[PDB]
TrEMBL record:
Organism encoding this protein: Shewanella amazonensis (strain ATCC BAA-1098 / SB2B)
Alphabetized Pfam families for the sequence: HDOD
Taxonomic superkingdom: Bacteria
Full protein name: Putative signal transduction protein
Residue intervals of the HDOD domain: 14-199
Amino acid sequence: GMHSAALLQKVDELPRLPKAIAELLDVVNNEDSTVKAVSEKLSHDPVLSARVLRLANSAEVGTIDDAVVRLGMQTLRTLVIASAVVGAVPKVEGFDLADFWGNTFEVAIICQELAKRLGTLPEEAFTCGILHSIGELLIVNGDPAVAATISAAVADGADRNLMEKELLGYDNAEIGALLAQSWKFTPHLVKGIQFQNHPKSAEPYSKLAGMLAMAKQIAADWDKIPDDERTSWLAQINILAGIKVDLGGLAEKLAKMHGQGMEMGKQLA
């Protein structure tokens, strides 16, 4: 849990955002920030702004002022958050960050669609997707030897999350949630991340965790499922996750968007 001793021992080890990035996230996480406030803050970080616009052009906006009008602020905020988070994540041994972030965006895009269907805020689900897998990275960087030992066990059939609990006293979902909490994301987001691998064990249930569980499975196994047998697959995932999402047209919609996250990942660099 979020208050387990082993997890809490990590709190002063977590990566810290640079002041200006923390301040930027404060501004764009605040639904009552003005367009001026968001635009002015971004204007001082042309590198991060360029990254935002590359993400915004993955489907033609050339400026942030432009994007505010072409995409609307709810979308712009979301892309700022993504760009800020991506910038705050270093190289990690054994990861290609274009591939890592591509997969993460795939999950985020899927979650956003699920939220639309469930009637929750789609930008919140997208953000939860952006944040969901960062704990994987934190474990590799913070505990390299243990991470490698875990991967070897996993190659021989062990469960990664259970291995992490055994050797670290917490798992990648918990430390990813702890990071999100430390970086001042909302409790809803934190709980979504925390329960991504066990959504039905949350009390009360977290829709975001259910969305993550579903979206992760869709992203992971998409290529294993014939193109004409997807709705029955999705139906089974709905049950495993506990999320009760309208399946009507879902397979068709997911197919339309498939790969758009990977393309976003390629635009980061």
